[PDB]
Amino acid sequence: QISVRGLAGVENVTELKKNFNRHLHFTLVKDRNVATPRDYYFALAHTVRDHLVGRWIRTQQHYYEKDPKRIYYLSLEFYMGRTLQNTMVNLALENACDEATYQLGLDMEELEEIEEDAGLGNGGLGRLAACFLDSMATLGLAAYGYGIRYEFGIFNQKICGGWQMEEADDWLRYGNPWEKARPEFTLPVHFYGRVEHTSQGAKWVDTQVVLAMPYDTPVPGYRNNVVNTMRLWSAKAPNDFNLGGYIQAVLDRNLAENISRVLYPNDNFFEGKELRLKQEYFVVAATLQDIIRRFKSSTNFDAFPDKVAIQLNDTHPSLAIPELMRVLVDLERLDWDKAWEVTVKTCAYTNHTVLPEALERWPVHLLETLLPRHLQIIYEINQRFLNRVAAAFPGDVDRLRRMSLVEEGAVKRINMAHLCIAGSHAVNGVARIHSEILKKTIFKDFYELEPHKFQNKTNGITPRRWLVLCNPGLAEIIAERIGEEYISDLDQLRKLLSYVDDEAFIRDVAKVKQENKLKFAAYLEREYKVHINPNSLFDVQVKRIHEYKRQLLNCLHVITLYNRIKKEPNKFVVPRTVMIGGKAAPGYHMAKMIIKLITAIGDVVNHDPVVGDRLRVIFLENYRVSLAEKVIPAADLSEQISTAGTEASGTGNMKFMLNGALTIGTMDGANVEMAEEAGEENFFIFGMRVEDVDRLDQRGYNAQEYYDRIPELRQIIEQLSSGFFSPKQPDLFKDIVNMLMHHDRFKVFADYEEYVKCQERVSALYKNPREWTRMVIRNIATSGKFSSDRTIAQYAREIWGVEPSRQRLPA
Amino acid sequence: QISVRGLAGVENVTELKKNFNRHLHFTLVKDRNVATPRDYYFALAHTVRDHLVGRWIRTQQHYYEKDPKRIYYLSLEFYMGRTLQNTMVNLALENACDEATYQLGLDMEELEEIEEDAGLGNGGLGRLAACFLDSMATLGLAAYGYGIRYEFGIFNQKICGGWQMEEADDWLRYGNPWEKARPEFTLPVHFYGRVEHTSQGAKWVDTQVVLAMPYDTPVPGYRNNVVNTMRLWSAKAPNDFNLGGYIQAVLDRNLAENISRVLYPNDNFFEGKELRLKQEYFVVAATLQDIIRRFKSSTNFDAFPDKVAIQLNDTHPSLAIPELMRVLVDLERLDWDKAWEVTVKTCAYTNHTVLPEALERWPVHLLETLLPRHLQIIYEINQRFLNRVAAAFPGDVDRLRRMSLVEEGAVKRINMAHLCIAGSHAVNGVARIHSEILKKTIFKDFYELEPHKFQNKTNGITPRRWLVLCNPGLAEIIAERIGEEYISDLDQLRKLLSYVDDEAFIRDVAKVKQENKLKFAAYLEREYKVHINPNSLFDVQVKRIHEYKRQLLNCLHVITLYNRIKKEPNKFVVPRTVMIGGKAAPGYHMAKMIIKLITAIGDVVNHDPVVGDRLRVIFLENYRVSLAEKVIPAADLSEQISTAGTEASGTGNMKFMLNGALTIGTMDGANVEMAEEAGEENFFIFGMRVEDVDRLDQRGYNAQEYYDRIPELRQIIEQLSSGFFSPKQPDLFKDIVNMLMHHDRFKVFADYEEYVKCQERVSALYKNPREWTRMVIRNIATSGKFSSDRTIAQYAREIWGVEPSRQRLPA
Numbered sequence A, B: 001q002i003s004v005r006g007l008a009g010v011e012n013v014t015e016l017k018k019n020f021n022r023h024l025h026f027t028l029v030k031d032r033n034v035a036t037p038r039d040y041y042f043a044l045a046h047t048v049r050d051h052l053v054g055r056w057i058r059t060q061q062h063y064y065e066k067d068p069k070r071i072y073y074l075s076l077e078f079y080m081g082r083t084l085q086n087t088m089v090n091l092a093l094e095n096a097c098d099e100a101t102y103q104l105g106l107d108m109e110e111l112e113e114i115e116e117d118a119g120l121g122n123g124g125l126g127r128l129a130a131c132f133l134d135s136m137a138t139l140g141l142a143a144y145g146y147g148i149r150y151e152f153g154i155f156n157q158k159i160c161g162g163w164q165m166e167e168a169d170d171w172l173r174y175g176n177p178w179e180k181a182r183p184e185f186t187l188p189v190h191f192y193g194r195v196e197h198t199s200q201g202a203k204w205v206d207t208q209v210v211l212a213m214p215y216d217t218p219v220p221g222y223r224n225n226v227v228n229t230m231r232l233w234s235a236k237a238p239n240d241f242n243l244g245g246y247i248q249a250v251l252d253r254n255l256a257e258n259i260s261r262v263l264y265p266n267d268n269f270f271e272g273k274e275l276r277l278k279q280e281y282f283v284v285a286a287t288l289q290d291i292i293r294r295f296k297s298s299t300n301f302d303a304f305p306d307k308v309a310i311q312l313n314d315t316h317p318s319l320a321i322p323e324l325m326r327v328l329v330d331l332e333r334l335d336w337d338k339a340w341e342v343t344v345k346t347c348a349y350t351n352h353t354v355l356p357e358a359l360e361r362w363p364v365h366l367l368e369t370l371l372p373r374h375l376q377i378i379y380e381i382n383q384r385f386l387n388r389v390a391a392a393f394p395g396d397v398d399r400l401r402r403m404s405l406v407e408e409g410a411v412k413r414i415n416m417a418h419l420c421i422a423g424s425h426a427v428n429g430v431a432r433i434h435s436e437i438l439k440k441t442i443f444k445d446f447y448e449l450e451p452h453k454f455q456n457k458t459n460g461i462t463p464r465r466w467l468v469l470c471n472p473g474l475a476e477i478i479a480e481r482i483g484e485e486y487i488s489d490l491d492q493l494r495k496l497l498s499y500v501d502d503e504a505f506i507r508d509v510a511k512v513k514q515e516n517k518l519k520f521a522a523y524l525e526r527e528y529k530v531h532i533n534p535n536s537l538f539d540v541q542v543k544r545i546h547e548y549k550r551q552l553l554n555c556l557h558v559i560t561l562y563n564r565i566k567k568e569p570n571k572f573v574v575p576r577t578v579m580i581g582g583k584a585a586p587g588y589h590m591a592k593m594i595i596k597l598i599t600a601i602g603d604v605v606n607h608d609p610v611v612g613d614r615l616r617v618i619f620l621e622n623y624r625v626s627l628a629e630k631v632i633p634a635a636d637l638s639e640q641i642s643t644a645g646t647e648a649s650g651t652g653n654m655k656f657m658l659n660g661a662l663t664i665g666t667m668d669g670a671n672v673e674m675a676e677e678a679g680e681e682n683f684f685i686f687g688m689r690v691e692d693v694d695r696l697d698q699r700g701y702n703a704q705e706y707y708d709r710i711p712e713l714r715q716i717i718e719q720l721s722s723g724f725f726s727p728k729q730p731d732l733f734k735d736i737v738n739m740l741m742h743h744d745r746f747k748v749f750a751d752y753e754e755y756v757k758c759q760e761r762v763s764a765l766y767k768n769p770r771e772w773t774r775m776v777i778r779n780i781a782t783s784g785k786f787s788s789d790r791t792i793a794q795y796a797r798e799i800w801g802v803e804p805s806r807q808r809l810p811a
């Protein structure tokens, strides 16, 4: 049907049809009389995956023969979403499969909806890993993603009586066609035990063993025939484990296997839970053995950093540093100084937040019991590091305690971020402002000691998933004017600037958005029985629920609009559909209250006859990658409204920009760079800058001052307090009011006035569809910088020391 | 190479080779450079299983169109062993696959050794289920085996310092190519809760739910294109199960899923363990819903018994009786009397033991908590049943308490055997003598009330696995003379009687045995580094370790032989290799002591220079189906030496008879019928008959009497007591001596003299190879009755009311 989806040739269509029928029969053991829609999905998935196999084998064979430097991306999260459409896109098979299935009497889009998301992440950090894997494959890098195969990913969110309920994400229930178990590469991982010091160095003995079994998932590059590997480890008990008493011993195998059972969803507050520590070591120990094995199958560890790069995605896999030291010193018998040099040159660390409560600070007593040898290595690293600090800054005793890897206090803790900086040759933030904040504030001491280590690598998103896949209509009208090359060279979108006055293009851009909005309005009614006005402005805020992200500020605006309508009912206002979605971490009470507030506002607003279809508030249940692919193309206004200095980058922001929504946002994270690329005139910027926040903190933030001077704000607080939004439980939102009034770390009131005024300017522009669309074109045209291909090319050149390549492998 | 293995045609060989290469590539993601032997096994398994699919779909389609009466064989055990060779045999693909793999540069026998046994059973009862499935498919019956998919089957046995150690049988570790998950037929199973009595009858409410997910395994008939199904249930938690606290709730899902985790190995002593009760209900509840669903997809439950037979394999699935009543009365709203009539006509029960400690007697308090509605139904069944007894035998109050389903005492218990008799239209024992013992002793009261219910169905074994597969050399020399028809009509082996004087045949039979012995002697040295004399008499006792099976009596003979050699070292004796193997239930202390005794005897005997190669004692580690397939063809003498009246049938006995070993045995179980078929002159019968045992019990068994009057026996006991077989732990075997002397339920001493004398007659015959072989021929020629095809034809005609068919389905 559409060009960017590839050719539907006679030979390929015929072959796809026959292979589909083969899989239905031999693989699924069904015929057409008894086959369920799920059977049809699986037959298609097997048919498509068959096309990856040869490319996968020859890519890995190529890496073996050429022996390039390998890149190992270590993450506890890979938020992959669905794989079927993405594989078709990268193989240029979409139109062929669409045709093939159509001729078989099936709707391929319906089949695509059957696939479970691989929800092996929480949000931004996990999705970044996934975009990065796509870009590394597209850029021809010899890259491997290494993580954990969680049996249960991020919970499915149900809303019951306006409240979040969590249910297990049993994503493997029906089997996963995208993985290949590799039990031949099973590796032992050690826990507990004790350290013996012999004449021949230290030895870690009397350990408990858990097996790490790898599962390989292909990562196809965009039409370059490259297929990289994501290897995820699963925990398995050894067969003599714990071996009535016999029955119990077999049942107890579960304890070992619990390591890979479930993804921790607490992205708000570091919890020093032993199981989480075990997960972190498990991935690191298995991965490092695999890396070392591959390196030896090329004695001379001097060449190790020439052949190996390890990227630590936050501090979660920070134990790689002392683990690499452990293997090099205890097992390979390298001297300390040489092992350290190798380690530093091998490892690099990416920081993803500045919020203190998210920083990993592991109790020493936990490490002492679980990983006794690693603790000793960490102490030794600390001593040698602090000796360097003392030599560089003689007599600066407070610097010594500030920089120590060991934090003294009630319970002694290890600061894993300090470990990561000490043991890495490169440390990067994820947007220019975030990287500057790292140098100026939280890692200032480290920057002063080793300024060469600190870099910026502004985040990006893959334009394959986040344009071609989710928004084929937009991809097509762009390709009609400028060709297909931009899909792997997103900077080419700049060429669209010469179409900003083009009447045909203006019309096409606006038409594609309208279609997307119609499609999404239909999705809502079908799957959720909720009815919306497709001519309204689609105002969307989707991302995890956090106080810093200020879904609450959005709520205040919504109530402001409702109150203004109720005050002057017969005045014209631009109709809006306000959509808010995202999961709250299960133990984060305030985030759970915020969800309940949003639904409670919806309950009042959506049933007020005077409002009509002029304002609708919808909570988007179970926000996840597959839902983002639907709502993002449909959005007009992207809400990116974190308090300046709190959102390290954001990546949702980039997705909306690429898909033709305008942005209302603070100068925070990557928003700054987005406004810089597009021009401030083409962005709806409001609110305190980082400097204004700092000024307010020095003086002291007094919320009462705002409450006292802003009558519209006072009214909303009175409504919340008195039970206007909770008639039967008048005090339901007392926690929210109290927080806003007395302990708001994120200064919701301070940005309220500017935000509301900025929103008025949004409504003004939307009244003029032609000027709205021209500004949209200026956003899409300047979104090129935010391709993860650019991001990965920078990591490659500036951190890993490898050159990317757009050259095809032979097919 | 050999004819009974089928044709190796050019077209088939070429196609097998290409499909093997296809699977290696697309299914296993390997090429020949990196492929492991396990990869080659899997490629072959996938290649073979492809040939089953069409036949499987059309068999099940055939059953749907013809709607024959369906047979449901309910068992907690299916001891299947390996599937690859068996599938090739039944599809006539063996020679073709051998050729195909040979041309690919692979040894197929080596590939076959890679497959794990499906060890989903303990011994005889589990293996019987497996032989029955093979025969039902071969006889064209619309039969389904229903059981549990244990994650862990019977433990692997390791011998460490002469002691049994158990390790988990993680048989699914590498995946199972012989199953297809069927998550679309997932069913809820209910536990706990309480009963409410409404106006509209009883209701079972507030239950906990566990999901039952089925996995289907094909059961191919012998060259008739029939492929039946074995459906095994796996336990899955529902997604809202139990839904920090979030993490724990996900981890707790294990509790629900533990139901199908492990096979109970305690075949010696009934343990009223709650988990075992849950397993029993789980299989019954899921199976009955599946049966009812299939029946409705044909209101009128009068036709239910015309379309459904349920065979209960022992009492383990006895809850089918009250479960069927529950569904019929509570859910379908049938009146009690009609529901009962349907139930009785549907269910039949097979008893497999008379040992009182093996009988299931569930504590009432367990059923009350776990299955409150079933307890009430059981009480009601009991009341109505006892009302019938009281009417038939007025005033016989002791009969009432003897026959009650409820046993009064310390803890009230339900006698599940009594439940099974009451609720079944047929009750059968498994050999003629066992069935007679049931009528005369343990179920005498029930027989008097309902004599028409009691039947015999003598056990059998499948001649596919137990001749063609394991002993192709023997199958071939038989086929050379009498054709191939005997493989599915084993009575045809009678034709071999006319070859008992045939010099060529005598030579061939003896040659095949010698080859088998050479092959097994080689297997031992390669896999276990143990060295044996292949010219010795192979004296084998393999079966689970139990006091009633009297491995101890065999031990006494072994020591007798050793002592006689030591007394007259320069006298000629027929060399023997005595092999004993079998697993002991983990909590069965005496059985564990017996294993240690056997190894301890081996330790003395095998290293005595005076003995030489004249006597060797070997403990066969990890006896299982795949090992039986190796040792049985190699055996000369089959030890079947249970105390008369204790072995219900035995089936190992039949395997040895079919494979050219002579039998030394008591007149117990099927041994009686074997001797009757072959002629007593062609069997080595010794020892007390059942009547002699009864006579001894009335008088009182005094072991001391034997010790006092038999000097050779006294010497052995003195040796055991003094520490001759345990120098460093002189009292190691004190438990064994004490048991033999003071509390031997199985009268080991009473059969000692006759056994030793009988063994002398065995040695005498073996000195004359020509006469040994002629007697062997007379055994093989009369083994026909013991085909499970005969057994199943009798169940079909006399219990299920269906006619078997040898007619091919079209291919």
Ligand SMILES: COc1ccc(/C=N/NC(=S)N[C@@H]2O[C@H](CO)[C@@H](O)[C@H](O)[C@H]2O)cc1
Binding pocket: A049, A050, A052, A053, A056, A175, A176, A177, A178, A179, A180, A181, A182, A215, A218, B026, B027, B028, B029, B175
């Ligand atoms: C290119 O992409 C792929 C990925 C996998 C394969 C081959 N895969 N081949 C097997 S046998 N895959 C198995 O499938 C099962 C699902 O039924 C999983 O449960 C199991 O973990 C997986 O190892 C082939 C190509």
Ligand SMILES: COc1ccc(/C=N/NC(=S)N[C@@H]2O[C@H](CO)[C@@H](O)[C@H](O)[C@H]2O)cc1
Binding pocket: A122, A123, A124, A125, A126, A128, A264, A265, A266, A267, A268, A270, A271, A276, A352, A353, A358, A430, A459, A647, A648, A649, A650, A651, A669
């Ligand atoms: C215990 O379980 C967890 C789970 C998650 C976390 C931390 N999760 N951390 C995230 S999701 N960090 C995000 O990273 C994105 C990519 O750079 C940025 O765009 C974004 O600004 C930043 O907030 C911490 C602990």
Ligand SMILES: COc1ccc(/C=N/NC(=S)N[C@@H]2O[C@H](CO)[C@@H](O)[C@H](O)[C@H]2O)cc1
Binding pocket: A026, A027, A028, A029, A175, B049, B050, B052, B053, B056, B175, B176, B177, B178, B179, B180, B181, B182, B215, B218
């Ligand atoms: C005739 O005999 C058969 C049996 C099965 C099939 C098809 N089977 N097709 C699938 S996808 N089998 C899966 O394979 C996995 C092993 O990798 C198992 O873990 C899983 O339980 C099983 O459902 C086809 C024919």
Ligand SMILES: COc1ccc(/C=N/NC(=S)N[C@@H]2O[C@H](CO)[C@@H](O)[C@H](O)[C@H]2O)cc1
Binding pocket: B122, B123, B124, B125, B126, B128, B264, B265, B266, B267, B268, B270, B271, B276, B352, B353, B358, B430, B459, B647, B648, B649, B650, B651, B669
């Ligand atoms: C708790 O776990 C268990 C496991 C097994 C059992 C009982 N297991 N019962 C057996 S294996 N019974 C055997 O049946 C064979 C077939 O008819 C007969 O040939 C044989 O004589 C008889 O002993 C009981 C409880």
